[PDB]
Amino acid sequence: IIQESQRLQDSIQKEVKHFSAICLPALLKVSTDGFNLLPSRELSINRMSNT
Amino acid sequence: QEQIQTAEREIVGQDLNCERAQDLCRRSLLLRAFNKKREEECEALCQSNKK
Amino acid sequence: HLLRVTNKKLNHELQSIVNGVQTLMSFFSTPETACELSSQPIFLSQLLL
């Protein structure tokens, strides 16, 4: 119980710190050929035009 | 035509500030959902501690 | 700030479970290894027949 309690110590503050560094648009997946989900940021239209 | 091109550059600069305000709103919604889910887990641990 | 309060509550409940279980286990320890405290036997298995 001491070992598993130490793993969970500051769990919320660890996840929030990692989440703060993420780019939300990189999570947004789109399917071109029905099977392959690519991040919308990897689409050439978005690489070239997205601010 | 120089005056027009200067004011066009100022309009494009404003569209960039609106997207930052929206990213903050999305992050704040996700972190509210996360806080609610962590309150439910904390309430479960509080019941285990009472036992 | 809400998440920082929830983190302190979660850490407090985690520490209370640790302290609660250590206190719970102190009732099961045999009197030979515990110092001079009046460890009056609680269980039938701790009594000398």
PDB file of C-alpha atoms in Angstrom:
ATOM      1  CA  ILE A   1       0.000   0.000   0.000  1.00  0.00           C
ATOM      2  CA  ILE A   2       2.920   2.421   0.716  1.00  0.00           C
ATOM      3  CA  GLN A   3       4.513   1.601  -2.697  1.00  0.00           C
ATOM      4  CA  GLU A   4       1.291   2.014  -4.772  1.00  0.00           C
ATOM      5  CA  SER A   5       0.330   5.171  -2.771  1.00  0.00           C
ATOM      6  CA  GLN A   6       3.764   6.701  -3.643  1.00  0.00           C
ATOM      7  CA  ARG A   7       3.174   6.018  -7.418  1.00  0.00           C
ATOM      8  CA  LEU A   8      -0.132   7.983  -7.234  1.00  0.00           C
ATOM      9  CA  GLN A   9       1.408  10.898  -5.242  1.00  0.00           C
ATOM     10  CA  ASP A  10       0.899  14.205  -7.139  1.00  0.00           C
ATOM     11  CA  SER A  11      -0.710  12.227 -10.063  1.00  0.00           C
ATOM     12  CA  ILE A  12      -3.078  15.131 -10.988  1.00  0.00           C
ATOM     13  CA  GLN A  13      -0.238  17.691 -10.998  1.00  0.00           C
ATOM     14  CA  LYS A  14       2.005  15.380 -13.133  1.00  0.00           C
ATOM     15  CA  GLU A  15      -0.764  14.835 -15.780  1.00  0.00           C
ATOM     16  CA  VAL A  16      -1.670  18.594 -15.897  1.00  0.00           C
ATOM     17  CA  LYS A  17       2.023  19.528 -16.441  1.00  0.00           C
ATOM     18  CA  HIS A  18       2.336  17.047 -19.355  1.00  0.00           C
ATOM     19  CA  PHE A  19      -1.069  18.141 -20.814  1.00  0.00           C
ATOM     20  CA  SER A  20       0.073  21.817 -20.765  1.00  0.00           C
ATOM     21  CA  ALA A  21       2.902  20.963 -23.262  1.00  0.00           C
ATOM     22  CA  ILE A  22       0.599  19.233 -25.837  1.00  0.00           C
ATOM     23  CA  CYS A  23      -0.632  20.718 -29.118  1.00  0.00           C
ATOM     24  CA  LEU A  24      -4.444  20.060 -29.190  1.00  0.00           C
ATOM     25  CA  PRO A  25      -4.573  20.160 -33.084  1.00  0.00           C
ATOM     26  CA  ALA A  26      -2.134  17.157 -33.168  1.00  0.00           C
ATOM     27  CA  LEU A  27      -4.887  14.980 -31.554  1.00  0.00           C
ATOM     28  CA  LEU A  28      -7.426  15.719 -34.289  1.00  0.00           C
ATOM     29  CA  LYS A  29      -7.277  12.665 -36.623  1.00  0.00           C
ATOM     30  CA  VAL A  30      -8.824  12.515 -40.133  1.00  0.00           C
ATOM     31  CA  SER A  31      -9.250   9.518 -42.508  1.00  0.00           C
ATOM     32  CA  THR A  32      -8.372  10.042 -46.226  1.00  0.00           C
ATOM     33  CA  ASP A  33      -8.773   6.406 -47.461  1.00  0.00           C
ATOM     34  CA  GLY A  34     -11.305   5.191 -44.807  1.00  0.00           C
ATOM     35  CA  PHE A  35      -8.585   3.086 -43.029  1.00  0.00           C
ATOM     36  CA  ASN A  36      -5.631   5.402 -42.187  1.00  0.00           C
ATOM     37  CA  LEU A  37      -6.248   8.005 -39.460  1.00  0.00           C
ATOM     38  CA  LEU A  38      -3.646  10.754 -39.921  1.00  0.00           C
ATOM     39  CA  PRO A  39      -3.300  13.828 -37.650  1.00  0.00           C
ATOM     40  CA  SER A  40      -5.005  16.790 -39.426  1.00  0.00           C
ATOM     41  CA  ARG A  41      -1.666  18.685 -38.970  1.00  0.00           C
ATOM     42  CA  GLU A  42       0.049  16.145 -41.328  1.00  0.00           C
ATOM     43  CA  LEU A  43      -2.372  16.924 -44.210  1.00  0.00           C
ATOM     44  CA  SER A  44      -0.455  18.948 -46.815  1.00  0.00           C
ATOM     45  CA  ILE A  45      -3.345  21.520 -47.030  1.00  0.00           C
ATOM     46  CA  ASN A  46      -2.922  22.223 -43.270  1.00  0.00           C
ATOM     47  CA  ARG A  47       0.938  22.083 -43.156  1.00  0.00           C
ATOM     48  CA  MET A  48       0.921  24.805 -45.833  1.00  0.00           C
ATOM     49  CA  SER A  49      -1.940  27.083 -44.570  1.00  0.00           C
ATOM     50  CA  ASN A  50      -2.486  26.521 -40.820  1.00  0.00           C
ATOM     51  CA  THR A  51      -1.037  29.359 -38.662  1.00  0.00           C
TER      52      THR A  51
ATOM     53  CA  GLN B   1      -2.618  50.694 -52.260  1.00  0.00           C
ATOM     54  CA  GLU B   2       0.146  50.722 -49.564  1.00  0.00           C
ATOM     55  CA  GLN B   3      -2.475  51.907 -46.997  1.00  0.00           C
ATOM     56  CA  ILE B   4      -4.782  49.017 -48.053  1.00  0.00           C
ATOM     57  CA  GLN B   5      -1.958  46.388 -47.823  1.00  0.00           C
ATOM     58  CA  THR B   6      -1.017  47.712 -44.339  1.00  0.00           C
ATOM     59  CA  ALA B   7      -4.607  47.413 -43.044  1.00  0.00           C
ATOM     60  CA  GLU B   8      -4.920  43.898 -44.660  1.00  0.00           C
ATOM     61  CA  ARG B   9      -1.815  42.786 -42.639  1.00  0.00           C
ATOM     62  CA  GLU B  10      -3.436  44.114 -39.422  1.00  0.00           C
ATOM     63  CA  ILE B  11      -6.681  42.101 -40.082  1.00  0.00           C
ATOM     64  CA  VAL B  12      -4.688  38.822 -40.635  1.00  0.00           C
ATOM     65  CA  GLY B  13      -2.810  39.499 -37.338  1.00  0.00           C
ATOM     66  CA  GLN B  14      -6.151  39.592 -35.432  1.00  0.00           C
ATOM     67  CA  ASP B  15      -7.410  36.170 -36.667  1.00  0.00           C
ATOM     68  CA  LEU B  16      -4.316  34.668 -34.903  1.00  0.00           C
ATOM     69  CA  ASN B  17      -5.368  36.072 -31.465  1.00  0.00           C
ATOM     70  CA  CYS B  18      -8.912  34.572 -31.691  1.00  0.00           C
ATOM     71  CA  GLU B  19      -7.501  31.019 -32.145  1.00  0.00           C
ATOM     72  CA  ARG B  20      -5.393  31.368 -28.903  1.00  0.00           C
ATOM     73  CA  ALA B  21      -8.485  32.369 -26.899  1.00  0.00           C
ATOM     74  CA  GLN B  22     -10.282  29.252 -28.276  1.00  0.00           C
ATOM     75  CA  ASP B  23      -7.344  26.928 -27.368  1.00  0.00           C
ATOM     76  CA  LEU B  24      -7.598  28.248 -23.752  1.00  0.00           C
ATOM     77  CA  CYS B  25     -11.385  27.523 -23.751  1.00  0.00           C
ATOM     78  CA  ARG B  26     -10.831  23.900 -25.007  1.00  0.00           C
ATOM     79  CA  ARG B  27      -8.056  23.280 -22.409  1.00  0.00           C
ATOM     80  CA  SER B  28     -10.230  24.770 -19.635  1.00  0.00           C
ATOM     81  CA  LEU B  29     -13.182  22.471 -20.599  1.00  0.00           C
ATOM     82  CA  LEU B  30     -10.948  19.325 -20.736  1.00  0.00           C
ATOM     83  CA  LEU B  31      -9.382  20.232 -17.348  1.00  0.00           C
ATOM     84  CA  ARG B  32     -12.919  20.711 -15.847  1.00  0.00           C
ATOM     85  CA  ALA B  33     -13.930  17.227 -17.079  1.00  0.00           C
ATOM     86  CA  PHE B  34     -10.626  15.927 -15.621  1.00  0.00           C
ATOM     87  CA  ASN B  35     -11.263  17.641 -12.242  1.00  0.00           C
ATOM     88  CA  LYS B  36     -14.770  16.040 -12.042  1.00  0.00           C
ATOM     89  CA  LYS B  37     -13.352  12.539 -12.828  1.00  0.00           C
ATOM     90  CA  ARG B  38     -10.620  13.001 -10.140  1.00  0.00           C
ATOM     91  CA  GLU B  39     -13.232  14.136  -7.565  1.00  0.00           C
ATOM     92  CA  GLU B  40     -15.145  10.837  -8.194  1.00  0.00           C
ATOM     93  CA  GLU B  41     -11.896   8.812  -7.688  1.00  0.00           C
ATOM     94  CA  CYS B  42     -11.147  10.818  -4.485  1.00  0.00           C
ATOM     95  CA  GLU B  43     -14.699  10.035  -3.194  1.00  0.00           C
ATOM     96  CA  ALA B  44     -14.087   6.289  -3.829  1.00  0.00           C
ATOM     97  CA  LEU B  45     -10.791   6.404  -1.804  1.00  0.00           C
ATOM     98  CA  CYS B  46     -12.611   8.305   1.016  1.00  0.00           C
ATOM     99  CA  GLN B  47     -15.169   5.424   1.227  1.00  0.00           C
ATOM    100  CA  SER B  48     -12.308   2.850   1.427  1.00  0.00           C
ATOM    101  CA  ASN B  49     -10.625   4.891   4.217  1.00  0.00           C
ATOM    102  CA  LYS B  50     -13.937   5.023   6.257  1.00  0.00           C
ATOM    103  CA  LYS B  51     -14.070   1.166   6.122  1.00  0.00           C
TER     104      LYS B  51
ATOM    105  CA  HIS C   1      -6.408  26.052  -8.605  1.00  0.00           C
ATOM    106  CA  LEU C   2      -9.370  23.585  -8.298  1.00  0.00           C
ATOM    107  CA  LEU C   3      -7.100  20.767  -9.607  1.00  0.00           C
ATOM    108  CA  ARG C   4      -4.405  21.795  -7.037  1.00  0.00           C
ATOM    109  CA  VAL C   5      -7.039  21.511  -4.217  1.00  0.00           C
ATOM    110  CA  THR C   6      -8.231  18.119  -5.601  1.00  0.00           C
ATOM    111  CA  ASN C   7      -4.541  16.996  -5.725  1.00  0.00           C
ATOM    112  CA  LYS C   8      -4.105  17.927  -2.001  1.00  0.00           C
ATOM    113  CA  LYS C   9      -7.356  16.039  -1.124  1.00  0.00           C
ATOM    114  CA  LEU C  10      -6.224  12.949  -3.106  1.00  0.00           C
ATOM    115  CA  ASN C  11      -2.749  13.008  -1.438  1.00  0.00           C
ATOM    116  CA  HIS C  12      -4.457  13.362   2.001  1.00  0.00           C
ATOM    117  CA  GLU C  13      -6.747  10.340   1.384  1.00  0.00           C
ATOM    118  CA  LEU C  14      -3.755   8.311   0.079  1.00  0.00           C
ATOM    119  CA  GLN C  15      -1.812   9.200   3.283  1.00  0.00           C
ATOM    120  CA  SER C  16      -4.878   8.426   5.461  1.00  0.00           C
ATOM    121  CA  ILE C  17      -5.184   4.945   3.845  1.00  0.00           C
ATOM    122  CA  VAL C  18      -1.420   4.360   4.573  1.00  0.00           C
ATOM    123  CA  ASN C  19      -1.781   5.527   8.222  1.00  0.00           C
ATOM    124  CA  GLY C  20      -5.110   3.631   8.597  1.00  0.00           C
ATOM    125  CA  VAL C  21      -3.538   0.324   7.425  1.00  0.00           C
ATOM    126  CA  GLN C  22      -0.380   0.794   9.584  1.00  0.00           C
ATOM    127  CA  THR C  23      -2.680   1.393  12.607  1.00  0.00           C
ATOM    128  CA  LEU C  24      -4.774  -1.662  11.606  1.00  0.00           C
ATOM    129  CA  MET C  25      -1.630  -3.889  11.399  1.00  0.00           C
ATOM    130  CA  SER C  26      -0.365  -2.694  14.834  1.00  0.00           C
ATOM    131  CA  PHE C  27      -3.239  -4.728  16.410  1.00  0.00           C
ATOM    132  CA  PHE C  28      -1.954  -7.990  14.778  1.00  0.00           C
ATOM    133  CA  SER C  29       1.754  -7.761  15.865  1.00  0.00           C
ATOM    134  CA  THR C  30       2.955 -10.220  18.587  1.00  0.00           C
ATOM    135  CA  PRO C  31       3.999  -8.742  21.997  1.00  0.00           C
ATOM    136  CA  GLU C  32       7.595 -10.206  21.918  1.00  0.00           C
ATOM    137  CA  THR C  33       8.844  -7.818  19.165  1.00  0.00           C
ATOM    138  CA  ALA C  34       6.970  -4.760  20.456  1.00  0.00           C
ATOM    139  CA  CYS C  35       8.668  -2.746  23.261  1.00  0.00           C
ATOM    140  CA  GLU C  36       7.330  -2.570  26.928  1.00  0.00           C
ATOM    141  CA  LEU C  37       3.933  -1.013  25.999  1.00  0.00           C
ATOM    142  CA  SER C  38       0.987  -2.794  27.689  1.00  0.00           C
ATOM    143  CA  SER C  39       0.092  -4.837  24.577  1.00  0.00           C
ATOM    144  CA  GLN C  40      -2.860  -6.529  26.171  1.00  0.00           C
ATOM    145  CA  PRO C  41      -3.725  -9.438  23.824  1.00  0.00           C
ATOM    146  CA  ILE C  42      -6.762  -8.631  21.634  1.00  0.00           C
ATOM    147  CA  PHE C  43      -6.930 -11.990  19.812  1.00  0.00           C
ATOM    148  CA  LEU C  44      -7.361 -15.522  21.235  1.00  0.00           C
ATOM    149  CA  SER C  45      -4.248 -16.547  19.218  1.00  0.00           C
ATOM    150  CA  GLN C  46      -2.179 -14.005  21.276  1.00  0.00           C
ATOM    151  CA  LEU C  47      -3.182 -15.578  24.673  1.00  0.00           C
ATOM    152  CA  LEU C  48      -0.932 -18.171  26.397  1.00  0.00           C
ATOM    153  CA  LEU C  49      -3.119 -21.285  26.919  1.00  0.00           C
TER     154      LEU C  49
END
